[PDB]
Amino acid sequence: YFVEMDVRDEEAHELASDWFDEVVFTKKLVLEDPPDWGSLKEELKELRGKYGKVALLLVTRKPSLIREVKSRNLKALLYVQGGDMRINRMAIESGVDALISPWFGRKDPGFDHTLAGMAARRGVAIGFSLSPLLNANPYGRAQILRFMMKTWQLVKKYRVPRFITSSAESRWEVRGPRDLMSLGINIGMEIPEARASLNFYPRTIV
């Protein structure tokens, strides 16, 4: 029983739905200041009726916006885009559902023993997204994979929840369950662990 935890495009969602038992549509939300919570809840409710289970992805540089959206206590899974060591940090502290790709755009993993400790305590999952790898060049590929490896070593050590995902913004970025398990495995996951990143852990979250 496999679960695609993050897809961000109607076309991608339907394709994943061939190969997955559960597909979570994700609303990408770029942010500088607070959003109209009327318009936002309305938009979120439509997606519940359209796609069933829904997630809200925050991409921002203001950490207070995490500790604001979170408070509104919306009827959707709360994701946050990684990259900004502030946002990474705040995301874990705020008890968010998952932090997506803490290494995004960085020259280092953007994740340490401490953040792992907090993530484990707060029950915050870590998203191992494929989409950046697809879009990166060989150098970048190698860099990202290194970051993913360190993150996994930590994630395994502190019993931190996690999943693997396409984070597909188009159908071309979509991959099947076993196709995604390759990423986990080659990052250092044993096969049973890589299966849990699609089965046991995502089940628990939704």
Partner: protein, 105 residues
């Protein structure tokens, strides 16, 4: 021992045997390099242009490496692609029956 990976190919357009044969050695060459490629021993077997399904061979130890190499693929001759592995088997006999009978070979 070798292992055989059956895969489906989703693309903007149907591809030909020559293109996939080539594309298998490109995914492995960038992902694993020529040394890693030499250790994994990938080998294109056949591709069914009708159903856009194929088979590729590898050492048993380096399956997940090659599965990763193909998922990592994006583009073949200026046309976006998706490789989906339908399954793995120790023989083309079991592979064709178990996974490729549907397409059908």
């Amino acid at each position: 021992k070798n292992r055989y990976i059956a895969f489906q190919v989703i693309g903007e357009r149907p591809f030909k045997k020559d293109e996939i044969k080539k594309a298998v050695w490109e995914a492995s060459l960038s992902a694993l390099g020529y040394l890693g490629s030499a250790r994994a021993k990938p080998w294109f077997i056949k591709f069914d242009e009708k159903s856009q399904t194929g088979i590729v061979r590898v050492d048993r130890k380096h399956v997940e490496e090659l599965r990763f190499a193909l998922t990592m693929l994006t583009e073949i001759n200026g046309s976006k692609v998706i490789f989906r592995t339908l399954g793995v088997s120790g023989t083309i006999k079991r592979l064709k029956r178990k996974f490729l009978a549907e397409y059908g070979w």
